[PDB]
Enzyme design. Structure first.
Site, PDB file in Angstrom:
ATOM      1  CG  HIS A  32      -2.155  -1.066   1.050  1.00 45.74           C
ATOM      2  ND1 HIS A  32      -1.638  -2.243   1.944  1.00 45.74           N
ATOM      3  CD2 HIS A  32      -3.149  -1.228   0.522  1.00 45.74           C
ATOM      4  CE1 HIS A  32      -2.804  -3.109   1.744  1.00 45.74           C
ATOM      5  NE2 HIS A  32      -3.593  -2.592   1.000  1.00 45.74           N
TER       6      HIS A  32
ATOM      7  NE  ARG B  82     -20.111  13.759  18.231  1.00 45.03           N
ATOM      8  CZ  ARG B  82     -18.518  13.355  18.848  1.00 45.03           C
ATOM      9  NH1 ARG B  82     -18.301  12.175  18.630  1.00 45.03           N
ATOM     10  NH2 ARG B  82     -18.105  14.328  19.385  1.00 45.03           N
TER      11      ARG B  82
ATOM     12  CD  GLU C  50       1.816  -2.028   3.236  1.00 48.34           C
ATOM     13  OE1 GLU C  50       2.233  -0.867   2.593  1.00 48.34           O
ATOM     14  OE2 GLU C  50       0.799  -2.619   2.941  1.00 48.34           O
TER      15      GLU C  50
ATOM     16  NE  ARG D 213     -20.038  13.997  23.129  1.00 51.04           N
ATOM     17  CZ  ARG D 213     -20.095  12.713  22.576  1.00 51.04           C
ATOM     18  NH1 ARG D 213     -19.263  12.207  22.407  1.00 51.04           N
ATOM     19  NH2 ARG D 213     -21.252  12.359  22.618  1.00 51.04           N
TER      20      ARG D 213
HETATM   21  N1  LIG Z   1     -11.914  13.475  13.245  1.00 58.99           N
HETATM   22  C1  LIG Z   1     -12.680  13.226  14.223  1.00 58.99           C
HETATM   23  C2  LIG Z   1     -11.666  11.881  15.093  1.00 58.99           C
HETATM   24  N2  LIG Z   1     -10.993  11.168  14.066  1.00 58.99           N
HETATM   25  C3  LIG Z   1     -11.051  12.479  16.304  1.00 58.99           C
HETATM   26  N3  LIG Z   1     -12.239  12.815  17.207  1.00 58.99           N
HETATM   27  C4  LIG Z   1     -12.212  14.126  17.662  1.00 58.99           C
HETATM   28  C5  LIG Z   1     -13.332  14.315  18.599  1.00 58.99           C
HETATM   29  F1  LIG Z   1     -13.647  15.614  19.015  1.00 58.99           F
HETATM   30  C6  LIG Z   1     -14.131  13.271  19.053  1.00 58.99           C
HETATM   31  O1  LIG Z   1     -15.067  13.516  19.833  1.00 58.99           O
HETATM   32  N4  LIG Z   1     -13.982  11.939  18.381  1.00 58.99           N
HETATM   33  C7  LIG Z   1     -12.965  11.905  17.736  1.00 58.99           C
HETATM   34  O2  LIG Z   1     -12.875  10.487  17.358  1.00 58.99           O
END
Ligand SMILES: NC[C@@H](N)Cn1cc(F)c(=O)[nH]c1=O
Ligand SMILES: NC[C@H](N)Cn1cc(F)c(=O)[nH]c1=O
Ligand SMILES: NC[C@H](N)Cn1cc(F)c(=O)[nH]c1=O
Lengths: 242, 246, 251, 251, 245, 245
Positions: free
Chosen positions: F6, F166, F78, F221
């Site tokens: 890859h 969520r 890799e 959050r």
């Molecule tokens: N792009 C989002 C993710 N890769 C990293 N991220 C960022 C946040 F704010 C979250 O609540 N949860 C995630 O997984």
């Protein structure tokens, strides 16, 4: 010749093939004194190994400490030394309202809320006593005068969250155990203790005989019992020598 | 009116609180005829039902068909009509060389290789019989003069791969069950069958009394005497029933 | 070659490669009478086996009794005797309000609420029907004048708690299945039955082709109470449909 | 009204918020007697409890007995009396060749071969020490002159089959643990013990600080039984490290 | 509000209700080129989005990236933007010797060797396409001239051990996956890939239609790369057409 | 004499590099390697942009991994075949503890394995934990930048949406397993949610590779600054330097 943890040998057991296994090393002497010429053999950590004679036969009394892990140790090492029958005595907490303090519980089956049973047989294998031991125990218990219940025992690796106690440092029970006590109750489980699942599974799956008897000391819904408890097991043991 | 599958009412049982539950419908009549005043009640699918009397008390005899699902149906609807006690009976194949054909196996606990048991209790609940029932069964079995084994039975949801048989269409056993036979034998398991896990778990977790007893007709340590062991098997479960009734 | 349970031989089948497998022995007779010259082959336990000719072609009809354990024995022994195709027909209860009593549901995958499927393949494997059997089945179903739904079926080892029924002796459901009906509903699952998970998995993982079609005889979500006219009608419909599906599968 | 098992009150701890928790009750006095003003508090079952002072702060030493169940009780009840920091000391058997007798293992994570951990957090949760406690042990260990390894400890609910021992009564290991030791060696695991998965998981998920350090007294990849003056030296050193580590954790 | 990873608005889609979802962001433009009025929309990370038209109706082409988590994100956000139908297209390596290079496979179900599916439905739930999409995909494949296989696809969270590759840094495969290829081979499994279990399960459990079609470019048990690629995307666009009329 | 499948690079291209910094976004790679010397475009295929740079005289890899453990495990495998032995995850994250503020740095000392790919390297029982030197070096680089720093447990999810509980999504449904789950991890002291650490940490700790994860808080959050995004890659580049001595 001499086992790793118990620090005893096969000659030490004088051909004993039955052991009474309380958890408390202090129960050990006292149980042996309902028998004859109690000999101290070894005392390492939670394992205090006594020989005594019962009805002119050699028997072991070996404490196990708390939990399937320490128990699996004592049972394995004793079996290496020829012991084939293992009698569990102690006290428990009842979760059925019809069960009173003073009563004896003989386990016909253990709910496997432990980890060490899994190291002997997978989870689908039943945690079940040897029928002869459970019979002897029921009889010995009835003859003692006590009210006696045969039934399923929830056996938990913990004393607090696994038995759904909330009166603890965090006041939190992990999801698996939330509402668990009420689930066992509606399923007719009689009590909570901490050793029978590892005991019964490792024995049922390794060609050993085992059973569990216990006195009810508290009832989560609602001494003479402790003394009649070891009395009941010494007599259960007697019955087992035929 | 009637229960959904069994096609009987509570009137048909005439106050019966004990059921005998053989697997195959063809044996229901044989068992009922060992008791007083046999009466055919109904036949629907694999549920053939009879009522008889033992020592003045009504007793239901009811086939279950094969496997945990149809057993779970019979036991549930039976219970709705007032049955509180279940004595399972049949013939089985042992897997322990010391167990002779002719002997009786009274199950003390079952390995849960089924699916239906999980519909009543999580995998950690023991599939165990009622102590009184296993006690009567052992009493009855010994009375018949046969040698008795109390021990663990492996209860599979399949006849073939779950009992690690390779003489099949594919010749293939899924990873879970490769070596399983030798694993069970080493663990002291006495025999295979296919309803006891579901029976014992559903009843133990539901306020019901249950037990299993089987005559060994063949040993997997590889019959002629099939007819005889069967006869002895149902005589024993009728005697166990009598003990349970009084 | 007398198989252990069904007790017929490969000869008894006359080169039959397709079987129709209802659950009820009583329905085996009626599926047969929709085909030509029915031949009782054997009857042992819930297993009633019949040869019949459909479009001049030998075809087995075999009762499976209730549940994956019973069904797996029947499919296994048929397959030892040359059967490569299996069509499950039956009744089912719908759990979507838009599915009416009398409609036909063809199963496109089953939720595995059973134990026997695990004896053939691990849970990650999909309990999926043969694409051709599902296609033929859907076509037969439309052509017969019924409304037709394709979608996922929840296949339970029990009729009672595994389908979240509380109208029972204990009146209670084990944690795992507590609230489960609403979960399948919210997931788009069409209905409940008892045998599709074991059949589809075992066949899909064993180079056998299979499919399931059922008639809706109840909808847990509809307050309505159906009749006996359309009951008898749509059970007659279902087996009539399963025979047109088989015909399409033959050529 | 002392705690159920431990047999002590909060007033006996004299305001201690840190605990050293060895497995063997015979070691508690020894550990205390490396500190200042050691007093015997209590001894019930496998729980032997002492109090001492370290640089003007009350410290408690409490044995745990063998295994997760026994450890969870000591830890819970110690926390109820105000202990927020738990430092595990012991001796161990390393399963890696490059790890030598007399070395120190400091656990950065535990494979969860126990059952008690699950009573606190689901299997997905890592059995992880507090970073400050593991940092404090690495510093103590190094300053002792010994070779220190930071890595993974496999933590088993049994001493025999679950550590894949075959020299037993049945000579049998259950399928799950057959080949397991080589698996762990291949995965870089340093040693077996029996209490760290429970302790770490319980503390990590409960607002408590924990870490594990052990002295390597035997290596199972090596045939030899080590010098028995290295036994006591490693032993003496093991508690000299956790006492210094504890002093670091204070301040 | 507006979609967090994709960087497009619902307006940008011009009413599109169907998306073609390739893994490689490099194939988005060429899929879109087979359709009328191709338009670049956005490129953020592994997510390159285009719009185009198929017989009067707007279609989106959105790359997913590698693995279930990336795919779960794209699908969810396209769903937020009004997409209901998802046609997965790509290239694959068969594991059945009877499946030849240049053939098309249509997945009728996936083995869930993934983690992300479990975030939408318990393991018992089948990773299974929409019947309509799989039928349109069958027909478009059949009409292309390629030999068409309907069957099960093993969907893996890894390219290496979970497809039982030993030619690796450690040379080592974890217990669960030792002997697994042969097992899938025996069970009839047609091929390996890495996104379908997540796609099929999340769609099948959230009221979305979805399916997977793939060109066989190589066989594990044993030009064409360019050729099978082209056939594969012409197949999916024809499938997309059938789904819209 | 060998190019990885890859990533499309050779060991020679790495110029002896035994250390890689591995962000999600390839656009960060050029950002990260801009903090270093003589950046060299090695390759870019799909979501894998591979850069050689010199840092304090030493050869170092920067390689994007895309989103999710599947994509990440390929990159790591890799690179590991090419001699890379130490991996430094940098990223953005979202805290779930009120006392943790936007702009803080989280160094992961352990991950809740809410992924699938970890399982392809070790059973669930095996801890998803960082190498100690890396965690220490990262903590050190984090405090030296002036920012407030937390050591602790990270919840690592194969999904951005339902596995981080969520509900603001197309369906609004969360599968039973993740119902109530945020509150559970909050109670267990879990610091933050992200999507790669469990796979990375488990695969590395079980394969004799060293790894760690540091992330910049961009949301809480229970309550993006470009300053905290820049802080993040400076700390990881500085963490790398302390790992090289
Ligand atoms: N792009 C989002 C993710 N890769 C990293 N991220 C960022 C946040 F704010 C979250 O609540 N949860 C995630 O997984
Ligand atoms: N110290 C307690 C013993 N381990 C057994 N036991 C006794 C109880 F009363 C009880 O409620 N639970 C329980 O586990
Ligand atoms: N007798 C029951 C059969 N097993 C099929 N079935 C029928 C229903 F109506 C139903 O609600 N569930 C169900 O499984």
């Amino acid at each position: 010749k001499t086992v790793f943890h118990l620090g005893v040998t096969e000659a030490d057991l004088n051909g004993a093939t039955l052991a009474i296994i309380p958890g408390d090393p202090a129960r050990v002497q006292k149980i042996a004194e309902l028998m004859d010429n109690p000999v101290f053999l070894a005392s390492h950590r939670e394992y205090t190994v006594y020989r005594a004679e019962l009805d002119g036969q050699s028997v072991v009394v070996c404490s196990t400490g708390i939990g399937g892990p320490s128990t699996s140790i004592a049972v394995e090492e004793l079996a290496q030394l020829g012991v084939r029958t293992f009698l569990r005595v102690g006290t428990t907490g009842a979760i059925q309202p019809h069960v009173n303090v003073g009563d004896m519980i003989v386990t016909t089956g253990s709910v496997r809320l432990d980890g060490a049973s899994l190291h002997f047989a997978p989870m689908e294998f039943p945690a079940v006593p040897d029928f002869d031991v459970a019979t002897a125990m029921k009889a010995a218990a009835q003859e003692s005068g006590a009210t006696v219940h045969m039934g399923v025992t929830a056996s938990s690796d913990t004393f607090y969250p696994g038995q759904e106690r909330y009166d603890t440092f965090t006041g939190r029970v992990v999801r698996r155990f939330q509402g668990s006590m009420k689930e066992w109750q509606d399923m007719g489980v009689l009590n909570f203790e901490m050793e029978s699942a590892t005991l019964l599974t490792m024995c049922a799956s390794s060609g050993l005989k085992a059973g569990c008897v216990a006195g009810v000391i508290i009832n989560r819904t609602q001494k003479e019992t402790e003394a009649r408890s070891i009395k009941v097991v010494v007599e259960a043991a007697r019955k087992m020598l035929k």
